[PDB]
């Protein structure tokens, strides 16, 4: 049932590792999943819907990991607190590079992919700002920029920098240096006057 | 001669203001430029080459403005020094939003557009790092992150944040707040321990 669904999704994630969605056919997904083409179309209307689902799963997985962290504070300095938070996204997206890369590209052509990405970005920005505000209310951070604006820029930094590193873009921060790079800019910009 | 060339480029920039390149035909560009379709193909092999040229012009214009600034230091504090530098890109790209938006999209489909963007990003990052290093050699900034890595992340931040603001993406920093937002993160991350 959804064993077939899960097989289709697993096949698609596997094939995206070697090639873009444009070079993957419904027939490729059916064959890998051990079903016919019409059987495929029972579970998904298009290969594009498969990618949307894969992205939805990855994004929700990151979001659920952040909710877990938010409910269960690590017992640590402010630097480590932000590092642990950024790390949810580094590891989650980092563990699904093909889906991340394909899903980012699909933002250009798919309103549903764009709206999905937008919804979660708003959520993560709102959460970032809430934490900055808490830190300001505690007297741990200075009241500099509007928190929501600072959060927006920091979140967009992370999007572009993590994804360029994962894709090995020229230029990009090496993947083994990206977490430390982002944490420094977050801590100095949130705590610095 | 290149009056016809300049007319084709001006027409394309105008039409990109109302619609994507995919909804602009060679015939639209010819007609706007006051020439026939075969006459068009004398100046450019495709509508895609027209966009490449427009982007090349905008990018080189920003780069020439930064070279000017680099040769002629504004007489001012470190915050204003970075603000003046970021502002070259805010105003240059900000004055050509349609070309900026279309050129960024074309990175996905055009190797020449990707390689153009990559070449200048490397250049601007190398320049950013050189300035950070100078500031460190002067004893004006602490030796924190590797300068080239810090420069990379800051430059990618600016790319994503400026372009999201210009496109009115959800989410995005409002255009009237983006310069101050980026300057704060640059100054605190370059000067902060
Ligand atoms: C509590 C914060 C921890 C840091 N954090 C992120 O890294 N940013 C979210 C982000 C946005 C785009 C792509 C990757 C990740 C947001 C929530
Ligand atoms: C001396 C610095 C001043 C600040 N600066 C920029 O804003 N970054 C370059 C950039 C990169 C992508 C898109 C827009 C602009 C780089 C050179």
UniProtKB/Swiss-Prot annotation, chains A, B:
Homodimer. It comes from Mycobacterium tuberculosis (strain ATCC 25618 / H37Rv). The record marks 155, 158 as: Inhibitor-binding. Disruption phenotype: Cells lacking this gene leads to ETH hypersentivity. Residues 25-44 bind DNA. The lineage of its organism: Bacteria, Bacillati, Actinomycetota, Actinomycetes, Mycobacteriales. Inhibited by tert-butyl 4-(3-thiophen-2-yl-1,2,4-oxadiazol-5-yl) piperidine-1-carboxylate (RF1) and 1-(thiophen-2-ylacetyl)-4-(3-thiophen-2-yl-1,2,4-oxadiazol-5-yl)piperidine (RF3). This is HTH-type transcriptional regulator EthR. Pfam families: EthR_C (PF21313), TetR_N (PF00440). Keywords: DNA-binding, Repressor, Transcription, Transcription regulation. The gene is ethR. One of its GO terms (molecular function) is transcription cis-regulatory region binding. GO terms for cellular component: cytosol. Binding of inhibitors to EthR induces a conformational change in this repressor, which is then unable to bind its DNA operator, consequently allowing for increased transcription of EthA and bioactivation of ethionamide (ETH). GO terms for biological process: negative regulation of DNA-templated transcription; regulation of DNA-templated transcription; response to antibiotic.
